[PDB]
Amino acid sequence: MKLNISFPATGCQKLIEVDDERKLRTFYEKRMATEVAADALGEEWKGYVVRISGGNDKQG
Amino acid sequence: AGDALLQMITIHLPSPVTAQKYRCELLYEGPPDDEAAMGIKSCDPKGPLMMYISKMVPTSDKGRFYAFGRVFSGLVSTGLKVRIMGPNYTPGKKEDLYLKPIQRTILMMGRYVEPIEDVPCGNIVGLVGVDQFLVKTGTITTFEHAHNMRVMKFSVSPVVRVAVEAKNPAD
Amino acid sequence: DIPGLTDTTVPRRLGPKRASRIRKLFNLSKEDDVRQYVVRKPLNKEGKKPRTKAPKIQR
Amino acid sequence: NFTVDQIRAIMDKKANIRNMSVIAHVDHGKSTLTDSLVCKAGIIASARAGETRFTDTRKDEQERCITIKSTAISLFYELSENDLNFIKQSKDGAGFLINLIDSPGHVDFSSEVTAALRVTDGALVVVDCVSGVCVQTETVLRQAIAERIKPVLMMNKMDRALLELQLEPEEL
Amino acid sequence: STDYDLSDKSINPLGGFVHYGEVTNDFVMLKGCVVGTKKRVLTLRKSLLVQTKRRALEKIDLKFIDTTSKFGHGRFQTMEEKKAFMGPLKKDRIAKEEGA
Amino acid sequence: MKVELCSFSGYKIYPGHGRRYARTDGKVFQFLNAKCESAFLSKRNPRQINWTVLYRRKHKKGQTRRAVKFQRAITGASLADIMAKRNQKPEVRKAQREQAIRAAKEAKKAKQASKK
Amino acid sequence: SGAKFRISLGLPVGAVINCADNTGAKNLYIISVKGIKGRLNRLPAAGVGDMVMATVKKGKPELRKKVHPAVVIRQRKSYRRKDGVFLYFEDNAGVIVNNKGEMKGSAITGPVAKECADLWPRIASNAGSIA
RNA sequence: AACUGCGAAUGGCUCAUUAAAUCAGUUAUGGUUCCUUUGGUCGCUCGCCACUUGGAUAACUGUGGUAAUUCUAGA
RNA sequence: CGAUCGCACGCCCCCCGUGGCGGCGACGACCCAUUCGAACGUCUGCCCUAUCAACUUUCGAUGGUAGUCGCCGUGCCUACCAU
RNA sequence: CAUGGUAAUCCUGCUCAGUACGAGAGGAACCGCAGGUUCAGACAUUUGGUGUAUGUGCUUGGCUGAGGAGCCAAUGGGGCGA
Ligand SMILES: [Mg+2]
Ligand SMILES: [Mg+2]
Ligand SMILES: [Mg+2]
Ligand SMILES: [Mg+2]
Ligand SMILES: [Mg+2]
Ligand SMILES: [Mg+2]
Ligand SMILES: [Mg+2]
Ligand SMILES: [Mg+2]
Ligand SMILES: [Mg+2]
Ligand SMILES: [Mg+2]
Ligand SMILES: [Mg+2]
């Protein structure tokens, strides 16, 4: 799974590839335009809340 | 595997330019000093067009065959008049001669087929519109005094024979 | 700061074009050097002489 | 995976075109080797890794794993700077174009191999490590030498030397 | 309570085991069916064989243990789940009226 | 601990319970028990059956905003540039206005002189 | 790989089921089931995913009086899917295949059971939805 | 390049349908609609932005997904 | 019941001195007329067949009344009647 | 524990392996894995069947003055059912 992470206040969107399902289980069972804490993405993302803007299916 | 194979075949397999220098005399039955022979040796995509049909692969429809072969000289385009000349054709006689423009030039991507407007020398290209004026082999040229190509030397011969007859005799 | 994500702010390619939007950005009240308060984008390519391009204001 | 007509835009400049045909004895994996080449490369061709590829483009060919009609493909690939350094022939850019033809290596010597070598300048001779040089390998090599083809060898099916035979490295 | 469940519930179904009673001591949960009626004494014995197949020597990790009522078509796992789903009833309403 | 399903009656169907019904038109239904599946198969309306959650919901039985503008730099005018431009309030804006006034005045006088 | 688990059969010999493909047959009359060793007095029976021999009773004359291999894709008998779901369909239906499990038709109306789908990849391709 | 506007309902092909149907001539719409062209009407109403008001999206930069399409997402 | 765009540009200056005024257009419009039409109707006219002589009318068939719908007239459709 | 009874059976798929063998076409087996058939011994968590708990609704004819509550019609009928 990949994550298109964008910070509008500075732009500079970038892609982060995440494999461990423990990181994505906090994202699972959510909807679009919902804010979730990214603290499960290691210590580097502590203090970060991110809104699920969209995505693309396995087939695009 | 593909990376290793490509990085060795690019290094060691020869280009058409270097290959046709020593290969022209083995595929062309005309004298080496001839303009067509020199054009084959140089592989210039401007001069005496020289294409040899090796295969006739069936098309999507049942009856028609793409005439697949190699261009040794000149530049084949779409809808240019060329002299379809068969294996038995001699330049002196009119037997096994046709002046016929070709319909379309295509490139075979295995399962896929992709049309292309033109193909210069030193490449493989299928031609549509040649099979009905030709059989089992042939050559294509824009040279009026063109000689034929040397025919294939098959290692085997049509040995095994079978008599065939329709189940319904009236067919 | 996330490396390369939350830092190194990139600029917008182009500023306001409607005179109302220029006044809104620069806190202009009314009729003060509006055509010269517009943002001029500098083109400075190496193969050509440098110059600055100004947008055609609207309204 | 570029446009089709850029193949014309590449074949305009020679010394980067490789007219190559793959020849071997029956069941020496020439079809699968060309499948790997198709999978990695491709101008409009795919990148599927699932066994069979554009070698056997017909019924009762991959139904019984038999190449009958010689099949031609055209592939494009851009090489790295060290690769262009390694190549010793003439080089016009990194955009190398390969005209690949597989032929039936069956023991009847199906004359489509003769046709492919008439069209071809360079042969990839495939041999099994555990089968050695069989009959049709010698036959197709003889035809290539008669037609002035440049041969390059490939020892195939090393996996059965590894695990099916369990050979020590000195024996291999 | 399995680690995938984390519910404060015992092996006893809602309403107790039918025709047995309430299980309070240690218990052994065996795969499949066992001879005898309910509250029939069973003798458990070590295997006389050597367990070498893959069916044996396999780690059984339970995700969920059903505790719905077996005295009919039970549809709730715990008393608290039933109360939370069904809300207050007439009995609870009059009980709260008496409690005040 | 599988996916948790819902019924004709809207009740929760735990794993190992009930039956799943796959209709020919592609619709898939699951029921808690034969009482629910008989009502569904007899084309009975669940909103007219008092113990169904659809009835208890139809009859009502038992039961942000913000506007944040983030300032950004633009090509040609940095954040400090636009700050210096928008902080021209202390009489600098008036100075620009009066120099525009005198520029217009001198342009008009020059136009009058050139015309006459 | 994976082998199909046992399911409740519910379609003995003599059952007439719908023919869900666009072949032109309306129904299939099951005359036997493949792989049935048999027992005395026991009718051979088939579930979803099973290959039967069938004759079409209603349909085109060029199909009608002949034996065809067929595969059952939907059954009305409830069967347990190893995860506790008991699944049954609105009708019994199958499709006409050859000896290689390749469909004679080109489309299937209605759902196809998962047990039949993963056992027959050719039927799964032409299946509309999988139940 | 893209947004906006217009055109794409013309032309071309064929004659399967169609027996008071189509169609030909005649007449009516005071029983209807009509892009466009052209000609009228646009100060006809008494009733703290007008020296000109608000917001968004393209194009564009950048991050992608899909084997694939004149597929498209987020910023 | 014009918050639109182009072209050369000029007049008034008392009050003044920065404003007020002007020509040629293009685009735009609610409605009217015209052009192009379109749509539905009026009268009359069509090949063979009676081994097709009685059809239509439950389910609109013919007409009336009042409606619905349609751009409009009308069983176009609905309800109630007449046959 | 003397003695007596006695029981398990067969097949398919994957892998081996497009392998051995064969010029080619074709094409195995041992180990291992996953499941079936027939049989056996159980069992009722689940699904289904039964159902006079004569449990609870509905309902026909009659009867108790009516309501309420019931009953009779050899189990009145029917739905759901521990
Ligand atoms: Mg403007
Ligand atoms: Mg129970
Ligand atoms: Mg019998
Ligand atoms: Mg006709
Ligand atoms: Mg004994
Ligand atoms: Mg026995
Ligand atoms: Mg009664
Ligand atoms: Mg009463
Ligand atoms: Mg009595
Ligand atoms: Mg009696
Ligand atoms: Mg019942």
PDB file of C-alpha atoms in Angstrom, chain E residues 75-76 81 84-86, chain F residues 4-14 19 29-33 35-37 39-40 44-58 63:
ATOM      1  CA  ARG E  75     -29.153 -13.968  19.670  1.00  0.00           C
ATOM      2  CA  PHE E  76     -27.145 -12.149  22.360  1.00  0.00           C
ATOM      3  CA  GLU E  81     -25.204  -6.658  25.331  1.00  0.00           C
ATOM      4  CA  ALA E  84     -27.810  -2.285  25.711  1.00  0.00           C
ATOM      5  CA  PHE E  85     -29.516  -3.418  22.513  1.00  0.00           C
ATOM      6  CA  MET E  86     -33.022  -3.779  23.894  1.00  0.00           C
TER       7      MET E  86
ATOM      8  CA  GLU F   4     -20.986  -8.900  11.464  1.00  0.00           C
ATOM      9  CA  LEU F   5     -24.214  -9.188   9.489  1.00  0.00           C
ATOM     10  CA  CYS F   6     -27.775  -7.882   9.765  1.00  0.00           C
ATOM     11  CA  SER F   7     -31.096  -9.527   9.013  1.00  0.00           C
ATOM     12  CA  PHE F   8     -34.656  -9.073   7.800  1.00  0.00           C
ATOM     13  CA  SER F   9     -35.359  -8.036  11.386  1.00  0.00           C
ATOM     14  CA  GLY F  10     -32.220  -5.896  11.501  1.00  0.00           C
ATOM     15  CA  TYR F  11     -30.889  -8.030  14.338  1.00  0.00           C
ATOM     16  CA  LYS F  12     -27.213  -8.885  14.620  1.00  0.00           C
ATOM     17  CA  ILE F  13     -26.292 -12.318  13.243  1.00  0.00           C
ATOM     18  CA  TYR F  14     -23.191 -13.762  14.868  1.00  0.00           C
ATOM     19  CA  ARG F  19     -28.924 -18.887   6.785  1.00  0.00           C
ATOM     20  CA  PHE F  29     -29.971 -11.805   2.033  1.00  0.00           C
ATOM     21  CA  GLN F  30     -29.127 -13.284   5.417  1.00  0.00           C
ATOM     22  CA  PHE F  31     -31.558 -14.123   8.199  1.00  0.00           C
ATOM     23  CA  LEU F  32     -31.142 -14.808  11.885  1.00  0.00           C
ATOM     24  CA  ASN F  33     -33.591 -17.717  12.072  1.00  0.00           C
ATOM     25  CA  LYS F  35     -38.945 -17.059  11.766  1.00  0.00           C
ATOM     26  CA  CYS F  36     -37.256 -14.168   9.967  1.00  0.00           C
ATOM     27  CA  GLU F  37     -36.705 -16.108   6.751  1.00  0.00           C
ATOM     28  CA  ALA F  39     -41.547 -13.649   6.970  1.00  0.00           C
ATOM     29  CA  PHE F  40     -39.174 -12.501   4.233  1.00  0.00           C
ATOM     30  CA  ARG F  44     -44.170  -9.655   4.607  1.00  0.00           C
ATOM     31  CA  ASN F  45     -43.254  -6.039   5.266  1.00  0.00           C
ATOM     32  CA  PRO F  46     -40.764  -5.754   8.163  1.00  0.00           C
ATOM     33  CA  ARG F  47     -42.072  -2.286   9.040  1.00  0.00           C
ATOM     34  CA  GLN F  48     -45.417  -3.843  10.026  1.00  0.00           C
ATOM     35  CA  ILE F  49     -43.916  -6.415  12.430  1.00  0.00           C
ATOM     36  CA  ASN F  50     -43.600  -5.007  15.917  1.00  0.00           C
ATOM     37  CA  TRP F  51     -40.420  -6.769  17.039  1.00  0.00           C
ATOM     38  CA  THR F  52     -38.469  -5.799  13.915  1.00  0.00           C
ATOM     39  CA  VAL F  53     -36.038  -2.919  14.383  1.00  0.00           C
ATOM     40  CA  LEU F  54     -37.515  -1.290  11.279  1.00  0.00           C
ATOM     41  CA  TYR F  55     -40.873  -1.044  13.047  1.00  0.00           C
ATOM     42  CA  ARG F  56     -39.317   0.248  16.261  1.00  0.00           C
ATOM     43  CA  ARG F  57     -37.521   2.907  14.215  1.00  0.00           C
ATOM     44  CA  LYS F  58     -40.523   3.872  12.079  1.00  0.00           C
ATOM     45  CA  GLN F  63     -35.452   6.347  21.255  1.00  0.00           C
TER      46      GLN F  63
END
